[PDB]
Nucleic acid binder design. Sequence first.
RNA 1: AGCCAGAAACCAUGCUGAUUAAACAAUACUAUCUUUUUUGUUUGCUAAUGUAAAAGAGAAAUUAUAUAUGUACCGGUACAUAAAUAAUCCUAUCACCUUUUUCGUGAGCUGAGCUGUGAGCUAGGCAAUAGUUCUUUAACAACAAAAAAGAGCACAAACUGUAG
RNA 2: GGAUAACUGGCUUGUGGCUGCCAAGCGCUCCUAGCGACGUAGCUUUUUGAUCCUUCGAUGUCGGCUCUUCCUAUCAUUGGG
RNA 3: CCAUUUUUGGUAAGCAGAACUGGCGAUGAGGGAUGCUCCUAACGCUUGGAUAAGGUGCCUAAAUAUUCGCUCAUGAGAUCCCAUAAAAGGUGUUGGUUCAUAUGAACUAGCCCUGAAAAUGGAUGGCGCUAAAGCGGAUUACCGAUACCAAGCCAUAAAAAGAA
RNA 4: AAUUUAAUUUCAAUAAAGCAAUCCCCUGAAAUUGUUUUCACUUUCUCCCCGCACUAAUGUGGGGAAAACUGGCUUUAUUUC
Lengths: 180, 201, 73, 185, 103, 55
Amino acid sequence: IDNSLNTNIHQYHIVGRAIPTAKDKNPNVYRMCIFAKNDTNAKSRFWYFMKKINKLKKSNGELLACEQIKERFPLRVKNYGVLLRYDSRTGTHNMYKEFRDTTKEGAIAQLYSEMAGRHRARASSINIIRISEISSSLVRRPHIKQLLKRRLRFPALHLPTLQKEYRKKFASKRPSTYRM
Amino acid sequence: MYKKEYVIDCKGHLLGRLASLIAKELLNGQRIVAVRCEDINISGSLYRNKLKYQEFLRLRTNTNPKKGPLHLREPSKILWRCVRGMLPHKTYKGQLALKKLKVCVGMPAPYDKKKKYVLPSALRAFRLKKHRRYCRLGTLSSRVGWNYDTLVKKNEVLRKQVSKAYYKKKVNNLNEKKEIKTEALNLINPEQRQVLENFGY
Amino acid sequence: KERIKINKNCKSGFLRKTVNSTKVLEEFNNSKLGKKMIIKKKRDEATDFERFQVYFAKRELKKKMTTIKNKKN
Amino acid sequence: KTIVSTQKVLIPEGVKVAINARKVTVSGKYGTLRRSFRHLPIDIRLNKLKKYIKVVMWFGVPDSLACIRTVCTHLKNMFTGVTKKFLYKMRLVHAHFPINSNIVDNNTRIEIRNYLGEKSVRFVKALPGVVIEKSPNVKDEIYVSGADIENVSLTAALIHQSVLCRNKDIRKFLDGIYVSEVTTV
Amino acid sequence: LQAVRLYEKGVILGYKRSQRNQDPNFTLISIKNVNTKKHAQFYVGKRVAYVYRTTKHHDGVKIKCIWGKVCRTHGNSGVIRAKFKTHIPPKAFGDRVRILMYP
Amino acid sequence: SHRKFERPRHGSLGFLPRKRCKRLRGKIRSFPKDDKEKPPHFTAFMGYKAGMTHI
RNA sequence: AGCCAGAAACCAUGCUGAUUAAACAAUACUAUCUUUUUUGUUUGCUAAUGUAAAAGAGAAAUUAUAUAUGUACCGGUACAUAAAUAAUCCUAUCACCUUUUUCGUGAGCUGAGCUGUGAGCUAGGCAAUAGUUCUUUAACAACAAAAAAGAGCACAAACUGUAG
RNA sequence: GGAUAACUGGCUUGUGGCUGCCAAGCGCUCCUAGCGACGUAGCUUUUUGAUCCUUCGAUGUCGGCUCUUCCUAUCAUUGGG
RNA sequence: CCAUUUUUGGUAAGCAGAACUGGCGAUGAGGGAUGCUCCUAACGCUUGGAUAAGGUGCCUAAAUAUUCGCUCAUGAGAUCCCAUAAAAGGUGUUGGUUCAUAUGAACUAGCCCUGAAAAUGGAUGGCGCUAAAGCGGAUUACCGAUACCAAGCCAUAAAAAGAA
RNA sequence: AAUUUAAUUUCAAUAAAGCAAUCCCCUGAAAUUGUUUUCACUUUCUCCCCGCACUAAUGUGGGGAAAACUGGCUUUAUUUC
């Protein structure tokens, strides 16, 4: 239960094979990791890739395993690099982008948020090919490179946003945006 | 009611939100006195607002402007007109709400004695990014030639100096009150004094 | 206001030991905002008798203060 | 975009800087110069002990970084102006006609008569705090001088624009008064 | 002064309106210092009194009463639904209503 | 469609409504602006039209 | 970012209307009449009632708000103080009469004395309950009667004609 | 009888009218000061169609006069490049 | 006669003519500001519930919600049917990608801009909105039909069942 | 507001011990239809050297060293700290 609120989307290891036949008595086993909102969606995404890659379809295959993946440490930061193929209005484009997070799932959430925000690209039009941990020295993006410096601080960059109780319509004196 | 009158200092506020928030309350039934109405902000630039007002000025009833729309030039009336836009003024509830709103340029003396309040959700540097262009309504009105600003500025400075003497008097009186209060904590019962210290005052 | 310099990662035990060592809650409470918050918390949770006692004490205080102000004239 | 952007702006030597209340102000040998930055997002700070001024912005974006350089260049000019005084030298060109230059209002307004033989009067008063002097060194030169780089430049430009005439060609009609040389005294 | 109350102020809003559509079965109350769902839930079962003054005497008094109870929320910012024993007047929209501390 | 030949309107539009004047007296709509420098003096005078001559 | 000059364009100025604002101010003279208290307002008429808001209807900085305000110096310098702001402060139910002490303020006499009024302290034993709750009839405003006290123009008609 | 023409209106804008982009040439030399073929993209309803949705128990069918208002795609006048 | 998809003639047409299905017609409640056909959903009379389409700054009922982007427009932009905008550009900003030697090229597509002219005054439905109330996501909460669930009542239909 | 016994790479401390020092939990980079082998990667409010106050900062840019406080693992007990 916890008390925890925001942000959800999960990681699944799915394994499947072609249905056994007289013609082939030892089907090829195919495995993939898939980021999805649930197991049924994860199976469908696996099937879409199985259909695109192989000539296998749900009617001609069998599930060997499907199991949810949990990240090794929830609170230790890693730099995840993700390679995407996405579709524009005209056609197809490739991108490999870098995200600092404690979770691969969080990095995918940032990626979907970026693809939506910077290109107006819909979830349907994205294909994730590999998300993996990248060393600090190796990183291309300057926005991730800046985080990786020796020392970091800010004088508070964010406006207040008090609880509903204290968002009342009238104030007694003029306030300030933030303390110095 | 919630309070006898809410008096609102329009300095630092953005037009739309101040009007919109007032309108829902106004419909609920509070009477609200907007003071310093000239010093409200529109979020467009000076040019952008001038352009919009010029277009508004262009609007007319071709066959007879005597029964046409009104190009209201007072900042209070501009605010009033905008609030009317946010009311169903053709209804009886709307007519009543429209009557309840009071708008005042600068600070009038029956309300200079009175307290003034502000709307924190309508403050410009709360709700508009710092680098964006903007314009004060009185300045905009002056820009499209409808200057009544210099008189208000003269009035405000005169009133503000007198007010400053009032504030120093109020502060002085509070200092003396605090001294008397602190003196008389010894004069009250110990156990009661200790209870009063324990939960604060 | 407070900050204590820390290592790269957390650790719950080392944080607990360091927080106990530096006495940060005490310093926060000593600071004015901590005082405002603890006074509000106590006041809210107080009993009807406690509330009457506070009212009674202020009423006593006002009587004495007015007596001084009259005497002072 | 950037986390931190900074600038360290050269010592104003022998002169009195003040950074209080967003209207950055330097006084010196030739004047006191005032210039607001209240609309800018920067934490301009006076370094003071070793002199210098330090400009810093937190969480900058490329426009803001540019503003830091614009402001530092302005501060450098402000220091230069009060220390040594800005001179805009304007040379008067004419193929034929005499242009009569009467500086009036105690060296504050140049009155111009007879550009292209016009027999009509062009008046240009100076902006606040700036001198319009003449050259004894060479006949056509006009000195526009002051503490503020902007007021002298604007005044000189206004003098040029006021003289310059509308209509027909210009390519062989080179006549007029033009800024030649930006210096200090 | 000697007439001191116990029971607390609120404002009786409209009916439980909808956009261009009307339900008079439910009334909407804004309760004076209540600005959130959790706080509205605190007073959820309470008896409500709408007291009003007449044009002229009835039996012998000029003061009359409609009785109700708050019964379920209508929002997240302190708007609560109250059901009364009969439909209340549109005349009384935006008026003050009285909230008993019982049960 | 457009008119065959172009002419302005007859008469000023700026004196509509071309109704009766409210008050008989020739009321001054606006005074000349005051000048602090000048010595105090009257700005207007009423007189009666007696007739015309040539000079 | 910051600025500047610059057009028969734009808004004022100017000028016209303004029962287009169901708008308003100042001045002059005036209508048995005006003022305070009490009771009432449960042939067309001749005593007479209304509130879209009472219920603690409590609340004085100021530019801001990528920093302010005092105070001391000479718009500038220095030193303080605020900074989750109404997450507050103010606040009021200690009835009675009687014993005793202090202080605010009014009034009469010609700044003092006394008395009245308002506020506190000190000592006493004394109040109520309508049989379980069914609006807490407690605010504002208007009026009629009863007592006590007070100080006129316009229209018309004739005449006019700068009006019709 | 608008179950069906001739009239406005309406859809459409072929046709008419107007603006483009390109660069082979023309423009002494020079693609673009001015032009602009061979192409290709729009806009408009200031033309005429296509049309037959509206009106056939009557919306008076051309032109002129008079008279006013609105547009700009600016012919002149102002400021300009 | 209308819509999707397939479709023939015609430059095109809210034009002429079809196919399959569903509608409308003859039928409506809620949404789409508004509207015969779009979406949700088809209706005895009532009470309560929980939702749909759809929304939740104010008009106008629910969030000035949360969360990450993008966006400044001297005519920004705002939801199928739905009421215009293209080729062509842009040293405006944002992501990419290919190349070359922390710098120079070249592309690419997001937004935004020029390209973008018309008749009473004028229209994201209006006000307004830019730390959005815009545009692209995602996260929750709330409001939201006469449909849906539960209950009552009415009639019809069918079924039980009956000749002290 | 909770709650049961399961399931599925959960933890986090507690106080006594060890192990290695960019090394380990990890994660990089490398050498036909298998494994495996190599060196890359932590901290620091430690110290030194150069810049000698050069800072966004109670510091700081560059060069080196230092350690295991810090962290990681193996243990042994411990869960109402």
